[PDB]
C-alpha cells in the first residue's frame, strides 16, 4: 500500500515544516494588505484532496468561483497561494488553498503500466492516503488545527460540481 | 510498509524526471566548463543508501576522501553535485553522488515519538525501500542504466569501513 508511505512523507517532509509558521505568514500578509483586503485571509492551510486524483496545476480554471488573489510571501522554500471564494457572485471567503501533491504520484502510478496499478487501486489508495493523513494529524493537535483536509469526488449523476462550495462548507465550520 | 510509497514517490517525482537527461548534462559538462586537469565525470547517478538512514546535511564531512568538485548544471531546477573520490591521496574517480532523500523521512519518523516507529522498524523499511526501488528500476531500463544504488550497512568496527571505498567499488565495475 503506497498510501501509507505517501501520507507519512507528505507530513514529515512538508506539512510539519510549513504549518508551524503559517499562522504568522498569513497574519503578516493580512497586516500589510489590510487597507486593500479587510476580509482577512483565513488562517489555516486548506488542502484539496480530489479523490479522482485529478490535479490541474491551477485552481485558476477549476472553478469560476475560485480566483487567484496573490502569492503568500515568505532544503525547501514554500510557494503558497491565496484565493478568494465567491458565492452568489460576491467574495465569500479568502484562504490559502492547494492540492495535496502526493495524489499526483498516485495518478502517475496508475498511468505507469509497470506499476501494475489499476484505477480501482488508485482510488482505494487515495482514500487510504486521506484517512492516514487524518490519523497522523489527529495525533498532532498543533498541526491538525493549522490545516483542513478537503476530500471530494465529482458526482456520478453528472449534476454540476462546485469546488468553491466544497471549500466554503469547511471554511464555515470554523467561524 | 511506508517503504512502498517512499520508493514510488522517489521514482515518479524525482528519478524518472532527472535520469532521462543525466547523461546529456554529464557529456555537456565533460568539456564546456573547461578545467585543465579535471578528470572525466562518470556517467551515472550514484545514490547513497545507508541502511541506517543516517544522512548528513553535507556529504563531504562523512568522509574526507569524498571531495566536492562542482555543481552539475542543467523545466524544473535540480541540484546535483560532482565529487572526486580519493584513495591513498590519489584521485581514483569523479562522479555525480547524493544520498537518497527518502531515507531522511524514515529517520525523522523513527525520531517522531507518535509514529510508533522504532529503529528496528526503520531498518526493515530501509531494506524494503532499497529492494522496492531496485525492482522499480529493473523494469525501467532507460533509467536503470543511468543510476547505481549503493546500499550498505556499516560494520561495528568503523575502521573497517570507508564510504569512498564503497563508492569506488561500484564505480569500478562498469563502463
Ligand atoms: Ca562503531
Swiss-Prot record, chains A, B:
Tissues expressed in: Ubiquitously expressed. Expressed in skin endothelial cells, alveolar type 2 pneumocytes, bronchial epithelium and alveolar macrophages.
| Chain sites annotated for binding 2',3'-cGAMP | 9, 14, 76, 101
Region listing for Cyclic dinucleotide-binding domain (CBD), in residue ranges: 2-175
Q: Coiled coil where?
A: none
Q: Which locations, inside or outside the cell, does it occupy?
A: Endoplasmic reticulum membrane; Cytoplasm, Perinuclear region; Endoplasmic reticulum-Golgi intermediate compartment membrane; Golgi apparatus membrane
Phosphoserine: modified positions: 79
Instruction: Describe what happens upon changing residue 104 to I.
Output: Renders the enzyme sensitive to 5,6-dimethylxanthenone 4-acetic acid (DMXAA) drug, leading to activation of the STING1 pathway
Chain sites annotated for binding 2',3'-cUAMP: 14, 76, 101
Q: What is known of its domains?
A: In absence of cGAMP, the transmembrane and cytoplasmic regions interact to form an integrated, domain-swapped dimeric assembly. In absence of cyclic nucleotide (c-di-GMP or cGAMP), the protein is autoinhibited by an intramolecular interaction between the cyclic dinucleotide-binding domain (CBD) and the C-terminal tail (CTT). Following cGAMP-binding, the cyclic dinucleotide-binding domain (CBD) is closed, leading to a 180 degrees rotation of the CBD domain relative to the transmembrane domain.
Disorder named in the UniProt entry: STING-associated vasculopathy, infantile-onset: An autoinflammatory disease characterized by early-onset systemic inflammation and cutaneous vasculopathy, resulting in severe skin lesions. Violaceous, scaling lesions of fingers, toes, nose, cheeks and ears progress to acral necrosis in most of the patients. Some patients have severe interstitial lung disease.
Q: State what protein this is by name.
A: Stimulator of interferon genes protein
Lineage, highest ranks first:
Eukaryota, Metazoa, Chordata, Craniata, Vertebrata
- The gene is STING1
Amino acid at each position: 500500500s503506497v498510501a501509507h508511505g505517501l501520507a507519512w512523507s507528505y507530513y514529515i517532509g512538508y506539512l510539519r515544516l510549513i504549518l508551524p509558521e503559517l499562522q504568522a505568514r498569513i497574519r503578516t500578509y493580512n497586516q500589510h494588505y489590510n487597507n486593500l483586503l479587510r476580509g482577512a485571509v483565513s488562517q489555516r492551510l486548506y488542502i484539496l484532496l480530489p479523490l479522482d486524483c485529478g490535479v490541474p496545476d491551477n485552481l485558476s480554471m477549476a472553478d469560476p468561483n475560485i480566483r487567484f488573489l496573490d502569492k503568500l510571501p515568505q532544503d525547501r522554500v514554500y510557494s503558497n497561494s491565496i484565493y478568494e471564494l465567491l458565492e452568489n457572485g460576491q467574495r465569500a471567503g479568502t484562504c490559502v488553498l492547494e492540492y495535496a501533491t502526493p495524489l499526483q504520484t498516485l495518478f502517475a502510478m496508475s498511468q505507469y503500466s509497470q506499476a501494475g496499478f489499476s484505477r480501482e487501486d488508485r482510488l482505494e489508495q487515495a482514500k487510504l492516503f486521506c484517512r492516514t493523513l487524518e490519523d497522523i494529524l489527529a495525533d498532532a493537535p498543533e498541526s491538525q488545527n493549522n490545516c483542513r483536509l478537503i476530500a471530494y469526488q465529482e458526482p456520478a449523476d453528472d449534476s454540476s460540481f462546485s469546488l468553491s462550495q466544497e471549500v466554503l462548507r469547511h471554511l464555515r465550520q470554523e467561524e
